[PDB]
Design a binder for this molecule. Sequence first.
Ligand SMILES: C[C@H](Nc1ccc2c(c1)OCCn1cc(N3C(=O)OC[C@H]3C(F)F)nc1-2)C(N)=O
Length: 895
Amino acid sequence: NREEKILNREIGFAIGMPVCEFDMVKDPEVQDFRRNILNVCKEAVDLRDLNSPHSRAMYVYPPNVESSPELPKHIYNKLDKGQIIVVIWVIVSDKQKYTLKINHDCVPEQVIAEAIRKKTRSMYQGKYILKVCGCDEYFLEKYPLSQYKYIRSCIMLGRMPNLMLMAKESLYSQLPMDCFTMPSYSRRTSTKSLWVINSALRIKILCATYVNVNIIDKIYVRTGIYHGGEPLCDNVNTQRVPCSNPRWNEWLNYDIYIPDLPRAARLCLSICSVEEHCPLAWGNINLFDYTDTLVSGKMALNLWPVPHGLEDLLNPIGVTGSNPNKETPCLELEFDWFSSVVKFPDMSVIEEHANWSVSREAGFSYSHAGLSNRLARDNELRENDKEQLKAISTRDPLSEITEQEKDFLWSHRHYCVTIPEILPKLLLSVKWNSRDEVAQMYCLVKDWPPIKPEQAMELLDCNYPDPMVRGFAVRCLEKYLTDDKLSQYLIQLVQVLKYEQYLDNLLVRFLLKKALTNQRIGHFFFWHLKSEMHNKTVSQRFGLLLESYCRACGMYLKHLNRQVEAMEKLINLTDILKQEKKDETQKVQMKFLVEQMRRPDFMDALQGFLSPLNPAHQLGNLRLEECRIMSSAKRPLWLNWENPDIMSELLFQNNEIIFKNGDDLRQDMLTLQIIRIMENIWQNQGLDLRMLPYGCLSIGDCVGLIEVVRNSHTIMQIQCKFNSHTLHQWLKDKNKGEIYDAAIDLFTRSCAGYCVATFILGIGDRHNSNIMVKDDGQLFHIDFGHFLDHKKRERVPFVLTQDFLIVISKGAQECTKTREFERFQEMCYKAYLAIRQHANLFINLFSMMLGSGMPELQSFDDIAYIRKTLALDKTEQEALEYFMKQMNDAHHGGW
Ligand SMILES: C[C@H](Nc1ccc2c(c1)OCCn1cc(N3C(=O)OC[C@H]3C(F)F)nc1-2)C(N)=O
């Protein structure tokens, strides 16, 4: 138990709260979560000690690979007859290099043998491993060399891959053997079915405590029964009462039969003032608990404050459950009593019912089917009907499905199985207050054909609360989501956890198992959860989840605790500079910083740890002379560490990170993720528009890290050394001679990609201080704090000034009327249309981010902006015409 107390101290330090605080939670759901999740921990630890030491090394250093070994035409043609030049370094005392020309699809074992052949010609194979020079990135698995992200990046950038031969035992001996230990908490009327209760739904509103307002006058409680965002019946209000005495003692009757209540049904309520009706406090509750039990008896629900922007009286897409703060409006509710415990029926009872319904419908006469548009006969399915179904399935997730299409999709639900990507539309067409239809939907979902992971992700958002539906989505992720794509969408998958009704669910088990079997996923999983630990709407869920992750991640908890301590020291320093030294000069502030940083406690916490931006990067000794307070808003810290890697000169000798305390970095994180997804779509279609999605990580409440791009300057820094020719002059000066055209091409291409990306996403206004350019000519944007409809009718955030057109047109006077400008336009058109073709992906990435309290992403109407910029109701020619007009009005001619 001495080991357990010390480990509980480590977990507490990592999570930010003491582990004893969980042990004090009375809630049986919380205690069952802590216990039951431990089998995911056990399965994951078993997988790691399955083929030791290799399986342990694969967990710690997973291959950083692309999803497909297939190289796009433009990328493959960058190779010399499908061959790549590679540099293999061998440490012999001294550093010896061996240059190899090998096929791109060579396995690391082939590369090692070719390297030993060259070393022998200068005068075993499975006793070595290839490492990337400069970082802790290893090639432990037998993939084609070009499938590794490092190599694919080298081919695309005309770079020389620098690999190092390392002895397997030099790596194996450095990987500590941890033993996962099961914690102390591992060792812990009648019952009737819901479908047997021949009664209507009723709930009693008793009274409200902690209703502190400005004597606001007459108040009432507004209630509704919801299934996700869909109302199951009409909303029921209490009688008006004075705020000075909030007492109702009233039963509210709902237009819903208790056996008709879906599994994920919720009571959505709010205390409203009044005619200008205004919500004061809101709260949501699950009608069934985690044990599938219908709510009974008395219950007190602590309510939440109204979000600035919500004018709606109820808030169904808000969080479910009581507010952890007990010094808030507290509404007492009483539920019905049935002289027994009521449970939702099990699968077998639901299947018997669905099979009974299917069989009964199959015997319906022509005239019976004619009574309802939701009933149709098997043989009466024409080729036109099948065409309309296929057409409906191509519509985007924000396209309204009329009541007629809903009846139509439901009556052809069996044909829908042949076009399985229609499932999200079919699910929104279901009568969720009819147990006959819901039971039939379950049986269709149970056996539904698998869909694409990016299509299944939609089924995990706020629109699909049903656990059978969510379980299907998770099964598609388990079978088809690669570790590369999981890493890419980890922020959306962590966000949708908030939409799970219960702590113990299929999604959380899938995510935890992946985090515990891949340290690269585990790292970002920990940081996305930890960064939101201040938010009291998810701190219990994320804290318990972090507790379970920290018990089984092994040795990585110790490395995480170094990054947590380094970040805390930096949060403490920046907090002092903004509260006690804000009005002092840069020199005075830098003197204060240098002194504080040099303290023994601080100095050691800020050196010798892994970059939270990229844990393959080691941060050694902090280089204090290169550290500075930046002139930008919130005055970020420019930080520089030595790369302690022996071959640091072959990658970067100093790792420079911007530490910023003051701004929400979540919108920046999402924009950068989208830019990368856009670039990925463009490269795959043979459209080389190189984007620069630099690293950005939120590490707490308005705190985070930004990856510094080396050899980059703002437009202002360029022109401050002014003519419109200054930018073109600088580029021509940085790329003198034969390499001039490559810079112009790179500028034009990066420029086209940023015009299209920023116009689609509606990014904040571009100016000279937030547009940067690398020496080689690569243009990129920084500071993505604003997106979508952030004003109140569509904007062009990136208006190409004379400066940009002069570069594009190679110094010509009439830049608007050149062949270079026409080709720049064609690049924009192609780019715009390609994104239009993947609209569902983008819409779903944003929809999964709605529970995240981001100011510009609160409703589906905020996401609707992307439907306008991508012109989705219009045809492809009309969408191109619309893009050209937006550009023309912004530029006052040219398009
Ligand atoms: C030498 C120095 N180099 C530099 C500066 C800022 C960023 C950068 C490189 O890399 C690109 C990523 N980046 C992103 C940001 N920022 C951002 O996103 O918001 C404001 C600003 C920073 F002050 F935080 N700044 C940089 C320079 N040009 O003064």
